């Protein structure tokens, strides 16, 4: 039977990978950072509060200008806000109200959304007419879209509930590349700052590092015990962080191919919806199901602060490109900008 | 504020007015979540998820079918948390058809949906399909294949009542939610009216929540 031989070879390769990872484990990150100055206490407050959504907000994404943001709610509404003055710049009605992700183009000309309709909708914000219309409807996934991120004005990357990721050319409207290999349903995406590789996290309790051009899985990371819901790169592109339903954040390293840090508390028994870093990367902001966010020290694994003030589950958070503010959206139909 | 800032504030206020009007329009609609193992005929018509809109007695019903989602239910069922009602279709003619038995799979799915923590106070309208075929095949096959502890008559009415009681017995904590059971037919549009009656009860409870005397 060749199946038993292939299974034995897979087990031997897994043991070899474990042996290599343990041979590359010299000293923990806590041992190195035992002699650095701890961040004392960070007390951010709500500078802004955006009202106008009449249902649960599932996603937000910031702008490159660090002033405009887009948010998606269950009322069929994609609202583009000016966060400095709290003005609704745009209100886009969606054909499907079951939206779970949204993206904003780095150029600022397009937005994207998707969800249970299994379609990535690209909307053009800058037309000769004064309205925002559907510019593209990328179809081809057989499961719900959980995340989408722009590479440029013509390329997008999506993660779906069909255990696969996709890279689409918007002008052609076709899947340029298909990323397969996950066993569980993919929940989150994160692009590298250099935009040549990306990490995904799925419900198989694993994260996968893929190359965009080659279309293959470079690396696989398995530390969690439950479904990974969020993922985010470190600012230098050499590490990333994940949050899952086992009430733990985990910081993994690309170059050592190993988990570096675990952020957990005995008082936290709820899952993690969204994670993001600060500008320097020493702050890890994680949104939880217990109606508040936790600001962790990324180097010392200490709870630096708590962002409390949402009356329902924090569904998403985002940090601006200049690191000025952190905006959180929750199921209480309110967005809050914290500083 | 400058001139264009004032005009932007005016545009934002117009957007708020349109959003409030759209929300007021959306709040006057009844949401139904369609689920089954088990025959969607005569319930929906009489990729993605399927939308259906119809009108009955000045009530606009939106019905959502999620049968094409061959994925994990726990990562998208919370989207349907504030649904007005959950319609659940169970075939009766598949008590002896093996997928595990089909009706045991229906019972497991009903136990999962009914006792979910997002559906603690969400009413369930239970339709029992294919009663004529079930009556035809109840003489050539007994209920002992599905229920070893039947101990009842092999007629149509007793067997139908037994399956109905077996499906209603899965309602743990039956003090905040109700299960409505109806045997599907093709006469006088009663299958719609039952749903209407069911959702009417929910509105009354919501009204008793809105007037603050529930």
């Amino acid at each position, epitope marked *: 039977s060749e199946l038993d031989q292939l299974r034995q070879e897979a087990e031997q390769l897994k043991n070899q990978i474990r042996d290599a990872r343990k041979a590359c484990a010299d000293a923990t990150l806590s041992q190195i950072t035992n002699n650095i100055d701890p961040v004392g206490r960070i007390q951010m407050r709500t500078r802004r509060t955006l009202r106008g959504h009449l249902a649960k907000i599932y996603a937000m994404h910031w702008g490159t200008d660090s*002033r*405009l943001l887009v948010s998606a709610s269950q009322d069929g509404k994609l609202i583009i806000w*000016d966060s400095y003055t709290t*003005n609704k*710049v*745009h209100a886009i009605p969606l054909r499907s109200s079951w939206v779970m992700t949204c993206a904003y183009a780095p150029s600022g000309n397009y937005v994207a959304c998707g969800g249970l309709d299994n379609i990535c909708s690209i909307y053009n914000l800058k037309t*000769r*007419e*004064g*309205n925002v219309r559907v510019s593209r409807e990328l179809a081809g996934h057989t499961g719900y879209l959980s995340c989408c991120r722009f590479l440029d004005d013509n390329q997008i990357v999506t993660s779906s509930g069909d255990t696969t990721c996709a890279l689409w050319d918007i002008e052609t409207g076709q899947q340029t590349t298909t990323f397969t290999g996950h066993t569980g349903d993919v929940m989150s995406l994160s692009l590298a700052p250099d935009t040549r590789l990306f990490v995904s996290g799925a419900c198989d309790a694993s994260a996968k590092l893929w190359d965009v051009r080659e279309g293959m899985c470079r690396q696989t990371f398995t530390g969690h015990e439950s479904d990974i819901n969020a993922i985010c790169f470190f600012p230098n592109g050499n590490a990333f962080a994940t949050g899952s339903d086992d009430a733990t954040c985990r910081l993994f390293d690309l170059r050592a191919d190993q988990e570096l840090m675990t952020y957990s508390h005995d008082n936290i028994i709820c899952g993690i919806t969204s994670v993001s870093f600060s500008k320097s990367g020493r702050l890890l902001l994680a949104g939880y199901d217990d109606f508040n966010c936790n600001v962790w020290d990324a180097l010392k694994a200490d709870r630096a602060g708590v962002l409390a003030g949402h009356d329902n589950r924090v569904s998403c958070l985002g940090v601006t490109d200049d690191g000025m503010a952190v905006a959180t959206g929750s199921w209480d139909s309110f967005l809050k900008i914290w500083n | 504020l*400058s*001139a*264009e*800032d004032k*005009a*932007a504030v*005016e*545009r934002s206020k*117009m957007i708020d007015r349109n959003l409030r009007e759209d929300g007021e329009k959306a709040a006057r609609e009844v949401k139904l979540l369609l689920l089954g193992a088990s025959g969607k005929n005569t319930i929906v018509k009489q990729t993605g998820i399927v939308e259906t809109h119809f009108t009955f007695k000045d009530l606009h019903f939106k019905m959502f079918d999620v049968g094409a989602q061959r994925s994990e239910r726990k990562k998208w069922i919370h989207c349907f948390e504030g649904v007005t009602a959950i319609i659940f279709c169970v075939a009766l003619s598949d008590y002896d058809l093996v997928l595990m038995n089909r009706m045991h799979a229906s019972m497991k799915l009903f136990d999962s949906i009914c006792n979910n923590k997002w559906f603690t106070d969400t009413s369930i309208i239970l339709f029992l399909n294919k009663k004529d075929l079930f009556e035809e095949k109840i003489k050539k096959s007994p209920l002992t294949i599905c229920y070893p502890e039947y101990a009842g008559s092999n007629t149509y009415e007793e067997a139908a009542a037994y399956i109905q009681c077996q499906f209603e017995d899965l309602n743990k904590r039956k003090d905040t939610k109700e299960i409505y059971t109806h045997f599907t037919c093709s006469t006088d549009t009663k299958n719609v009216q039952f749903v209407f009656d069911a959702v009417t009860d929910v509105i009354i409870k919501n009204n008793l929540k809105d007037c603050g005397l529930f």
Partner: single-chain antibody
Framework: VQLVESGGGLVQPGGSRKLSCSAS????????MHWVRQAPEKGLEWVAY????????YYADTVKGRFTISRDDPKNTLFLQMTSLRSEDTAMYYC??????????????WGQGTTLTVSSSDIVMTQATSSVPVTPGESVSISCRSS???????????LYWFLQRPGQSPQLLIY???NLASGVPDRFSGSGSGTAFTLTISRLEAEDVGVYYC?????????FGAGTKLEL
């Protein structure tokens, strides 16, 4: 996208006339609308403005109490009713499209205009250059001065640069300071500070011949400057 105005003609003084403008090719209800007139031998003069949704109805001082601006959004039509007409109302009337949000481009599209002939605390925009001789392939700079500083506290400088080709409606070259409009080639640049401004054309073609107009948008009334004419 087009705006076609209608009406006009010869009116005896003291009369009344209703100018109309039909809008096509854009979402008319989402745009604020302006009426701007041009004297038969002089520059551009702003007349009236109506907002999106008709919540803000503002007029110029010289036409206040006699002119009425209105809109029919299902009919996609803008109206300007004129009573007690003077001989100074003889002009070429343009209907102007203007949307306002963060990063928008107001005064982007202009109508063709209609001719009306009648028988017989404001920022002063000053640009002293006129009849500037130009050569193709050469860089030309047009200056602009404002009585009040146009740098608002939000960091924006409300300066608009327009081009008037012979026999053509004005076209928006630059909407806010150092912001090129859509369809404008990357040889027009706009710079300045406070009350001093300049428009630089790196290498002008034969299509860059016309009258160049300043406009401010810090405060309403919206005043233009007496334009600078470029001739070969």
């Amino acid at each position: 996208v087009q705006l076609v105005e209608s009406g006009g003609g010869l009116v005896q003084p003291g009369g009344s006339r209703k100018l109309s403008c039909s809008a096509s090719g854009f979402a008319f209800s989402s745009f604020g609308m302006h009426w701007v007139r041009q004297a038969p031998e002089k520059g551009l003069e702003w007349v009236a403005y109506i907002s999106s949704g008709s919540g803000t109805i503002y007029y110029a001082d010289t036409v206040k109490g006699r002119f009425t601006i209105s809109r029919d959004d299902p009919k996609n039509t803008l109206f300007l009713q004129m009573t007690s007409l003077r001989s100074e109302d003889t002009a070429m009337y343009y209907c102007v499209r203007s949307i306002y949000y963060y990063g928008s481009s107001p005064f982007d599209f202009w109508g063709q205009g209609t001719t009306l002939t009648v028988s017989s605390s404001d920022i002063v925009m000053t640009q002293a250059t006129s009849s500037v001789p130009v050569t193709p392939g050469e860089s030309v700079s047009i200056s602009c001065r404002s009585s009040k500083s146009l740098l608002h506290s939000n960091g924006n400088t409300y300066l608009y640069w327009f081009l008037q080709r012979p026999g053509q409606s004005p076209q928006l070259l630059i909407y806010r300071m150092s912001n090129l409009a859509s369809g404008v080639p990357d040889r027009f640049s706009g710079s300045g500070s406070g009350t001093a401004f300049t428009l630089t054309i790196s290498r002008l073609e034969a299509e860059d011949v016309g009258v160049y107009y300043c406009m401010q948008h810090l405060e309403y009334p919206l005043t233009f400057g007496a334009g600078t004419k470029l001739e070969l």
